[PDB]
Design a protein around this ligand. Sequence first.
Ligand SMILES: [Br-]
Ligand SMILES: [Br-]
Ligand SMILES: [Br-]
Ligand SMILES: [Br-]
Ligand SMILES: [Ca+2]
Ligand SMILES: [Ca+2]
Ligand SMILES: [Ca+2]
Ligand SMILES: [Ca+2]
Ligand SMILES: [Ca+2]
Ligand SMILES: [Ca+2]
Ligand SMILES: [Ca+2]
Ligand SMILES: [Ca+2]
Ligand SMILES: [Ca+2]
Ligand SMILES: [Ca+2]
Ligand SMILES: [Mg+2]
Ligand SMILES: [Mg+2]
Ligand code: NA
Length: 645
Amino acid sequence: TTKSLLSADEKITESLRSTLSDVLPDQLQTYIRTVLQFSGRPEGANLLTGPNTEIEFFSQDPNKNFPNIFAKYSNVLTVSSDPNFITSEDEEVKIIWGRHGSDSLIGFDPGADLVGKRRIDIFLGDFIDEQFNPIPGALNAGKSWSDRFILGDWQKPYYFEDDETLGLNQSAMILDFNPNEDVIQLHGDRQDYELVNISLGTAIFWREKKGYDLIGVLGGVSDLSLKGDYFEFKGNTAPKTVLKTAEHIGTAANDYIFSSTVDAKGNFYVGGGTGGSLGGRNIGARDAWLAKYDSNGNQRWSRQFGSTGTESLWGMASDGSNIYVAGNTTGQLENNTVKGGNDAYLAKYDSDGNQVWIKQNGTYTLEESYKITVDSSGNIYTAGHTFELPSTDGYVAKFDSNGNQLWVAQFGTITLDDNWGVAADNNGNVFAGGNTKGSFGAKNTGTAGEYDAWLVKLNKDGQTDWVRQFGTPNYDFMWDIETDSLGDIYATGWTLGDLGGKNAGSYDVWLAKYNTNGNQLWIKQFGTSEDDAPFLDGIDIDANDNIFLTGNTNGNLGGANAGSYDAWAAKFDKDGNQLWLKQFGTPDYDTATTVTAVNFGKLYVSGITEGSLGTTNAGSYDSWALKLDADNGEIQDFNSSTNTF
Ligand SMILES: [Br-]
Ligand SMILES: [Br-]
Ligand SMILES: [Br-]
Ligand SMILES: [Br-]
Ligand SMILES: [Ca+2]
Ligand SMILES: [Ca+2]
Ligand SMILES: [Ca+2]
Ligand SMILES: [Ca+2]
Ligand SMILES: [Ca+2]
Ligand SMILES: [Ca+2]
Ligand SMILES: [Ca+2]
Ligand SMILES: [Ca+2]
Ligand SMILES: [Ca+2]
Ligand SMILES: [Ca+2]
Ligand SMILES: [Mg+2]
Ligand SMILES: [Mg+2]
Ligand code: NA
């Protein structure tokens, strides 16, 4: 069996070498080989057989530049504790990079058709910016977080070919697993696995009577045990259902709500991304989707659209009757226009679920867009960022109801500026907000380029009225903004510092208010000793100027934690007094992603879960929508109405 262990090392080495060298671009192979060579890790370097190729950043062809090449083969997540909210089965090899925070990393979609496909997901739990940045004395120097690498769920092991081979065509490769801190999540129980010592570290094999299948390789770690607390086993039964009052949305694939809205008749909409056939037949990898509910909880229609590439619905807004939707695509959604491979889109749906038009910005420059708003006059605003040194800059774009572009405003600093907010006032003006490593509206007090929050006010012509910036010396991260009926601008985010008050521990939530003239009115901060943050579409403001916030916590923020991260929602008045704070979820990972206030004192909070929220989990990530009473945060049945029982 010594001979069998030697044969496994050869077959794994030759299989990974073949796939990584065929798929990864030569610029990426060259960088990775240099890091491994410099660290004297030849076993890793010798997996990459492409020629040494110069790394380029200043080509006139964006497609020849390292960031654009890297973008195709990566999911680069945020400074937050992130679920992989950008996962999609669109490449054979993908780098999944958590960066700071306690990330819940998945790359595989167990509901996708991957029979016979090569799949390697390369996981970096941390590999925080400070590890690459040579400047000394950063606040977050040496910091690491507990990352969870998801290699199976209650339904099935991931990367499983279930055949007569060692199952080398599909595998995870985890590069920075720390058994003192991180977790590897597996299907089944410890009797279903064998650990094998290989040249690269540890091989995790699925083992049954019929044979062996490689599930993952743990780079640079040896002599682990399946009895370790760093392995979490999910068994083979769906989790018990909680919150049967929720609307449940799920397929066997990874399904996400990322946004919601309401129209002038009280119809409630949700939308996001899916790796499955949720609102229609899957077109390939992740698709965008949206669904309409009447004011009584009844689904009217669902729609799914996209490409063989990756797209999501990240924002939606209504003019009262139509539903405008925005997000990102790696495909070509508008047949009149070229595809850049990483492009913003805007589409218009009518109340009957017809796609009236779609507009795509087909340029080769990397573009992301997570935010949309509609004004009184029915004009549409989107916001996002575009990536002569390499860097993101913010933009706002204004359109008419026929999808004609009225103007585009681009702005920012010499360094990273990301957009996480757009909101119109009732007065022809539009606000944007986001994160910057630089000094955009103030000198950034961060000594190693830690993020601050920024806000811009633009007028009806896209000219800048003002820029503001606020922050601590540590990372502060904005997720979302909204206007009230007076035209004041509110932003929400997390901080690792003392922004509105003394940090309670780890990530805390903040809520900032500026007046229309750029004066900061107040910043509130709240949290537990644990990780608390709003997320994605995390603020809304009703007709009465009540502020609603939503996101996730792994503490006891609104009540006892059910397990992992839970969702939370809060109500504030326009002077920043907290009126209520509710927490809800499953024993498994949950987060809210969006909040929509409606009328008759009801509110919808929607999000994602790895558990059974509303009904039995259909596979991996599922989504949910909860109807709350706006007076006290009490959960109502989604289908509750005054005319039914
Ligand atoms: Br060497
Ligand atoms: Br980020
Ligand atoms: Br470091
Ligand atoms: Br996307
Ligand atoms: Ca992260
Ligand atoms: Ca991390
Ligand atoms: Ca980690
Ligand atoms: Ca396998
Ligand atoms: Ca797709
Ligand atoms: Ca910039
Ligand atoms: Ca800061
Ligand atoms: Ca906290
Ligand atoms: Ca939970
Ligand atoms: Ca699912
Ligand atoms: Mg449908
Ligand atoms: Mg919002
Ligand atoms: Na299976």
